[PDB]
Design a protein around this ligand. Sequence first.
Ligand SMILES: CC(C)(C)c1ccc(-c2coc3ccc(-c4cn[nH]c4)nc23)cc1
Length: 355
Amino acid sequence: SMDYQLVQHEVLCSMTNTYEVLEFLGRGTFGQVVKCWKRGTNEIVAIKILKNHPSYARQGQIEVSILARLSTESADDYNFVRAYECFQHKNHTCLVFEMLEQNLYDFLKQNKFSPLPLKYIRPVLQQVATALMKLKSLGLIHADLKPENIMLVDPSRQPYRVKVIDFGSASHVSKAVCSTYLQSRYYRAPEIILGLPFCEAIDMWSLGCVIAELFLGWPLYPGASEYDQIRYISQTQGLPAEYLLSAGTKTTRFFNRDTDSPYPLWRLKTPDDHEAETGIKSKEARKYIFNCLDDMAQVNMTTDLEGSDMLVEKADRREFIDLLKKMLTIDADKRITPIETLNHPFVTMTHLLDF
Ligand SMILES: CC(C)(C)c1ccc(-c2coc3ccc(-c4cn[nH]c4)nc23)cc1
């Protein structure tokens, strides 16, 4: 229908190159990704075919332009997917990319959703943080940072080497209206849930969510709904400060003023009450429930580690949970920046130089 009918050995012809399709890789919201041979060479490329509908075309245009703007000496050094050229094929916008093998969700699934050791998280974090730092420097917001939009180039030959993909939803800071609906729910920053002003800082929330997921091998805050998403956060991290709630355009979707402002007593709607007045049922969707983020320090501790090698782990976790809290700071103004994360002990390993 909206999805171009895949053809058994289709020839996708741009103006400078021609491409043979080898493998249908799957379909997403944007469209489908197909593995292709670049005729008369030895290189294999991923080609994103967007849906026929005009909207997607802008999304591709948006993405195209940002990749156009991000076309420079090296995407490789700042760990975002190399885009090559954009072309039309039967009322279909097609984008050519470097082939990438596996997103972090697929990887985790392959690993039976067992937690990733911190020593393999670290490089991933470094790369994504680096990407974010580049984005900031261009005043860009990615706005869909999530496991499926971080892809391992080639896990076997290049362990833990990642590219950020999909700049379809990306955006300049100068254009960021309050109470815009952005981000995958699990990776959505409070400032979007509550309808507060926002910027590149939202991506840092997503990054925190991603690294916690990796640590746990399951999402930290898997809300079925914005109500659930904010309830979960609130349980673990406390209610967002009054000043945040009072300013949010969406606050009263989820919270009541139990006393009149000024100095209002904000309380989360009870799940029951919420259900009553919305027609949305509250679920319990999470494998791990934490009274605070500190308690993450102690879960899934290896029971097969002696002396110095457990001390190291203890140290490492402490550094991790310290960065994670900074990343998952509800007020964006107080939230750690990419550069700061890059100079945090957990990344730089300064905390391990004496073992
Ligand atoms: C099946 C599904 C939808 C999860 C998927 C997604 C991406 C890819 C993919 C494989 O290599 C790629 C290279 C670039 C991109 C891309 C997506 N945006 N912007 C770039 N995507 C890919 C393969 C499968």
